[PDB]
Design a protein around this ligand. Structure first.
Ligand SMILES: Nc1cc(CO)cc2ncn([C@@H]3O[C@H](COS(=O)(=O)NC(=O)[C@@H](N)CC(=O)O)[C@@H](O)[C@H]3O)c12
Ligand SMILES: Nc1cc(CO)cc2ncn([C@@H]3O[C@H](COS(=O)(=O)NC(=O)[C@@H](N)CC(=O)O)[C@@H](O)[C@H]3O)c12
Lengths: 580, 573
């Protein structure tokens, strides 16, 4: 069997008197009074080795330096003075033998602090990525990756128990998730390309057409996007699909799945069911289709109060949203929120102060005429600051919702735990204020609400969709919808999305024919697995929960990718670089 | 909650008297004696629905057609006579309601027979692939895909219990000089990612990172000849371990495989697996992937003919002998001889075995050494002796292929699953010298001094897992000493510029303390095809490419608009 008898970091007082064999890295060396103290590291933690001058292991111990790999044998004994910061802190290993398995030169950054329970100084991420195999020696990085393992294993356990069949779908396929495709040239016939999948969407629907009933996959998705916050050229999804389901069925199974993951992987109980809010209700109360429920400060609509007002900018406005903050902001803080507000298309930010009887500051003059009804609607108290955005309903909500989020940081609010919610009843379409056009909120295979089918021709903008987003602490972690299983309706919805018979046959012909052979009702969802794991670990970037990620430009400094290729290899594909 | 109360195919006698709601596809319709019989299908199997003339669903049941999607409601009843070919064979559902959820065109091929337990006529695979979503309705295809699920889940359960960490590795990586599938980098035309040939370097770096043991259901991409039932991308079970010897890797993979077969197939694999050195396998079977489902081992008999007048035997480097337990026809022998010649042999000698002597071909030259030849081959009266004389590797390889062909001719029973390890492969082979698998494969430590003196005799710490004459897995212990790795490169004539070009980043990683480590990769698609008795891995892949590497279902690979390609800064030559 293995020479190793225990993991180094797993030794305890119960092992005293036992002879052990250990293998690991030298976390640090310290010589004192002729003794050589070596902190031996493996994935379970640190344990102290002691090399005594009279021991055969001493000569070898004198050569050892940090990050050397060694095999150690000796007796477990109590330390005269225990180190309470270590799980092995009460014991040490009196060495009888020591062998060097590998030498190592000094690393470009330290990996030893985390294993001692000490704080780790910040290191250049570009350098960490260049030496990612060393960065992954740190305790925090291994904790993240082992959490990722526990999460995926819990997903397998739960969904296998629920009858879901894991199916692996192709990576070399044809060119719809609303992004740019990554292409793979077909060598035997230039001009032909595969496309890496933006998602397994159409394959998992065809698996429902095939009668598998319910499917899941830890699928890798590839999307070539530009301006994206914390973008990676590829990412991981928990993808799943179900047949003969309504919206409620997909939601019910997912929250039960999420509760199982958090319980088994984090030991956290998630109260069930998750809170549910419609798209309209979420925008009105929070000005965001991904509300952050870790605090209050809800938005109140104050439009019907200004229909008799001399303030033309309020009285004419479609919407005036107000927010009461429990603090008297400085003009700098107000100006900070005003800049945030203006960045979201608002006409401006109004401000004031709530005082014992009247109002003071900002637009306080215009606040004085109204009060009995207004104070009841906002519950504002002396010492508060009132902020207002007036405008179109969607603008007014979205601008003051971003102000709401920014103000939570300025005020230093304690935002704790994990607050999930479902956002449901999305409109089938979203108005592009920029391009003055209709665009879909979820992919074009989403089912419109069946009660609204006649509105497809009459009034497109009123059509609801059977779509849903899963939100965690103000972040979209998942999204899905009930699909269209009737071929007539799917073409209808394509013609409505500016797609004629030509683009349909070329881009989706195979799938539309599949719907003609008896497709069942079905729907599903996809999680952003990297995103969810980043939130579960309090990481600021998904790069902290991916083993070998790219940097912000989509480059790999460790391997040198992307890189050029020989002219010969490029001619073989029948392609050349366009000369500028 | 859900509308359906049960899976259609899950109903048994225990459900009699219950009112059920079922949803599925119309497998078949029969009108008999005024009753309308509908076979309702879902993934769990068929159940018989019965519409009676008095039932509100009578008219509906009459107009439905095969593959229509329907929701049925009714009372579970015993059949008057059970149909034991259905798991639901004892019961039926008296229809009170029938609702059409989707009509369906006539499929281009049938998908109903297998669900009744009937043989299915072979259909054009191109047609099956073009309508794969219909092909996957067949029972056989759903059983394959669900076995694949149970196998992967069993791998997760076992390796998680043994302390392995699943780690996902990049799909967009560095192109290096097999041919790489490339991915253009939009922001700088002329730069490309590559899809990974394997996770090798990444999993070795995870050992350098101290994770100790890793695994991954990894996808590999290799743009090479697709003949021999190859796909552009395929699935490996890939794992790596630290502080291990060859023994440790084999032992864990044996127990893992036994667990997979037990949980996924209900089959018990005796442990430990047999082991043969590469040399023993070639000597006894003429192949580095022996098929242990039958005997017929090869025997070296060259040293019996050193004083024999028969030139071709006497002067041959090696004479391999094979005893078939049947007297062959003059035709069969010529088929085996043609097989031998097809494998570089000079020919195939033969002779029939009698009670007191020989008779057939070289029988005359065998009588002088009769006693020794029978103790060596254990041949008996009625057998047929076959011989190939020539170079050791040629004679073994040729008669080993004859051995396999003879198994078919004799109609031998080849049943079950026979695993074995092939170990102690040579580290190098002639061309100057070259490696036999990967330049990171560790030499056998007790052969290290031979690395420069006699390279051809250096054993490697490599191993192949073979199932019924098919390689299903392979791996090795890796080099963790950069000084030894440089020593191997010097022996191979691989200069520094070439090392940095191919392995620079990983060679530098060895300088930071790499532990002893090793691993293996299974050909998961190949294994599943063998576990299901399928002739091609296409049968165990949901949406595979055809034999030519193209996807008839979607039409990929297909052209793109010139503006989609212009945006990447590339143009067709
Ligand atoms: N996390 C993450 C990172 C990056 C790096 O640049 C890009 C991402 N692009 C997406 N995600 C995450 O995947 C989730 C689902 O993807 S989806 O496009 O919304 N919907 C679909 O794909 C539908 N086919 C699902 C269905 O309808 O069943 C999002 O909620 C994000 O958490 C990304
Ligand atoms: N099944 C299968 C199908 C196809 C369709 O085109 C192509 C294949 N190419 C390979 N395989 C299967 O993968 C196994 C391991 O792959 S390897 O190249 O030998 N070694 C390695 O890749 C090392 N990284 C492993 C290590 O040393 O740890 C083989 O034993 C085959 O069963 C293929």
């Amino acid at each position: 069997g293995m020479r190793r008898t225990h993991y180094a970091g797993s030794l305890r007082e119960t092992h005293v008197g036992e002879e052990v064999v250990l293998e690991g890295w030298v976390n640090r060396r310290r010589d004192l009074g002729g003794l050589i103290f070596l902190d031996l590291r493996d994935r379970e933690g640190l344990v102290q080795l002691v090399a005594h001058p009279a021991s055969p292991a001493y000569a070898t111990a004198e050569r050892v330096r940090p990050e050397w790999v060694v095999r150690a044998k000796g007796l477990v004994r109590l330390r005269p003075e225990p180190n309470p910061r270590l799980a092995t802190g009460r014991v040490e290993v009196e060495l009888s033998a020591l062998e060097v398995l590998a030498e190592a030169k000094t690393p470009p950054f330290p990996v030893d602090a985390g294993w001692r329970g000490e704080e780790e100084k910040e290191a250049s991420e570009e350098l960490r990525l260049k030496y990612r195999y060393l960065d992954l020696r740190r305790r925090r990085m291994q904790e993240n990756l082992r959490l990722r393992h526990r999460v995926i294993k819990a997903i397998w356990d739960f969904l296998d128990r629920e009858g879901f069949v894991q199916v692996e779908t192709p990576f070399l396929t044809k060119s719809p998730e609303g992004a740019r495709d990554f292409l793979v040239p077909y060598r035997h016939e230039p001009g032909l390309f595969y496309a890496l999948p933006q998602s397994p969407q159409l394959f998992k629907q065809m698996l429902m057409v095939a009668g598998l009933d319910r499917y899941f996959q830890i699928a890798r998705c590839f999307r070539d996007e530009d301006l994206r916050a914390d973008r990676q050229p590829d990412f991981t999804q928990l993808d799943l699909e179900m047949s003969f389901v309504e919206v409620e069925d997909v939601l019910e199974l997912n929250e039960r799945l999420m509760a199982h993951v958090f319980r088994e992987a984090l030991g956290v109980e998630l109260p069930l069911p998750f809170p549910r809010l419609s798209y309209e209700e979420a925008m009105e109360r929070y000005g965001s289709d991904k509300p952050d429920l870790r605090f209050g400060l809800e938005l109140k609509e104050v439009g019907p109060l200004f229909r008799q007002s001399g303030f033309r900018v309020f009285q004419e406005a479609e919407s005036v949203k107000a927010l009461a903050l429990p603090k008297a902001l400085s003009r700098k803080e107000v100006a900070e929120l005003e800049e945030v507000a203006k960045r979201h298309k608002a006409q401006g930010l109004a401000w004031a102060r709530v005082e014992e009887g009247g109002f003071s500051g900002g637009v306080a003059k215009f606040l004085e005429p109204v009060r009995e009804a207004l104070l009841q609607a906002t519950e504002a108290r002396p010492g508060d600051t009132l902020l207002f955005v007036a405008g179109p309903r969607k603008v007014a909500a979205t601008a003051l919702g971003a102000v709401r989020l920014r103000a939570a940081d300025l005020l230093g609010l304690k935002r704790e735990g994990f607050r999930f919610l479902w956002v449901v009843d999305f409109p089938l379409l979203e108005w592009d204020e920029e391009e003055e056009a209709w665009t879909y909120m979820h992919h074009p295979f989403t089912s419109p609400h069946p009660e609204d089918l006649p509105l497809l021709e009459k009034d497109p903008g009123r059509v609801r969709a059977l779509a849903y987003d899963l939100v965690l602490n103000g972040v979209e972690v998942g999204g899905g919808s009930i699909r269209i299983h009737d071929p007539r309706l799917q073409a209808r919805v394509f013609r409505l999305l500016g797609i004629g018979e030509e683009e349909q046959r070329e881009k989706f012909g195979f799938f539309l024919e599949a719907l003609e052979y008896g497709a069942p009702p079905h729907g599903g969802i996809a999680w952003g697995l990297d995103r969810l794991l980043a939130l579960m670990t309090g990481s600021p970037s998904i790069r902290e929960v991916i083993a070998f990620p790219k940097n912000k430009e989509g480059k790999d400094p460790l391997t040198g990718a992307p890189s050029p290729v020989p002219e010969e290899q490029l001619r073989e594909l029948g392609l050349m670089v366009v000369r500028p």
